[PDB]
Structures are given as C-alpha cells and as structure tokens.
Amino acid sequence: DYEDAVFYFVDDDKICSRDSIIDLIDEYITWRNHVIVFNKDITSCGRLYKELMKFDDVAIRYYGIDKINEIVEAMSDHYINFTKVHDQESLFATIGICAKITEHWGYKKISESRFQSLGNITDLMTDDNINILILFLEKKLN
C-alpha cells in the first residue's frame, strides 16, 4: 500500500554511510511524490532531506525553468541519460529534476502508474557520484 510507504531517512539530520546513499536518493525521490499525493506536511523532515530539496535550485540554475518544464513534459522520452552524468553540478541538477518530475506527477494525481519509469538509479549513482554526494552532504551537515 503506497499510502503506508516507510521513509527511513525523512527525519535524519546526518548521513555518514556511503552504502546508504542509493537508498536515500530512491526514497527521497519517492517522498517528493508521496508528500503531495497524501498531503503529508512537506516541512516535517530533517536537515538531510532539506539539503536534497536545495537541488531543486541547482536544477533551475543548470537548465532554466523553461527547459525544466520541457523535460518534465517529456518524461511525463528520457531527456537525461543517467549514464552521461559525471560531475557534481550535473549530478545535483539531475536529482533535482527527478524530484521535480515526481512532485509534478503528484500535483497531477499521478503516482503508482509511473513507478519504475525514470531510468536506472544504478546508472546515475556510480561510485564516483556516490562519493561526490556523500562528501557534499557531510560538509553541509557536519
């Protein structure tokens, strides 16, 4: 039952295990849909989720709002090839874009019909990208 999905990192203020990074991004991208679909309080989350939410701004800086709106329309075509994302700004923009897409779906009353549709998280979260992300988050959250 999607209503009863569990979010293990939602109240965390820290992350300090690289082996949790994929789980965290997977959950967080689901949460940006779920929080709209079930009208949960978007403010009831910890510093870790708040840091990830700032990647919305990174995506806007990187793409601009028109291209964002375009990419979201396309996905809802995989505009972004996760296997081609190899630097910090591109990585954070891509996480931001994924959050915008699943949030947008929630605004449109779309959820389960688009599960397993974004592409392979393991293509995005190479070991280097995992390291980029966790070092960044530790520096912000230390």
Binding site: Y2, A5, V6, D26, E27, I29, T30, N33, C98, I101, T102, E112, R114, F115, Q116, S117, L118, G119, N120, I121, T122, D123
Partner: peptide, 9 residues
C-alpha cells in the same frame, strides 16, 4: 518498497 526508478522496487 516501491520506486520511481526502473531498477528498484
């Protein structure tokens, strides 16, 4: 767990 990613859930 469910997921929006194709290689998860």
């Amino acid at each position: 767990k469910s997921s929006f990613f194709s290689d998860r859930g």
